[PDB]
């Protein structure tokens, strides 16, 4: 047998949302990078801003930059607050 994979919980697709109010772009997938829609950090302090309104957290900008797509950024603030993590090398 093997484990199941992470479910896609409700913070990604709100996640998904905001990429889209921010960028105004048609669709956002799960792993879509905002970057590649064309966001910019200019853009990136606006969604950080609007997920404080939604979500009731503020946004940590370097897991943001770690991870530039709605589940993966859900995932690594996560891990960030996980009781045990593995030691990972960033600029």
Known sequence: GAMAKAPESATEKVLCALYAEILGVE??????????????SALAMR???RIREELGVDLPIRQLFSSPTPAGVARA???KSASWSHPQFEK
């Open 77 to 79: 603030l996560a891990a």
């Open 47 to 49: 969604l950080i801003a």
């Open 27 to 40: 669709r956002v997938g799960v792993d879509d990078a905002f970057h590649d829609l064309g966001g910019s």
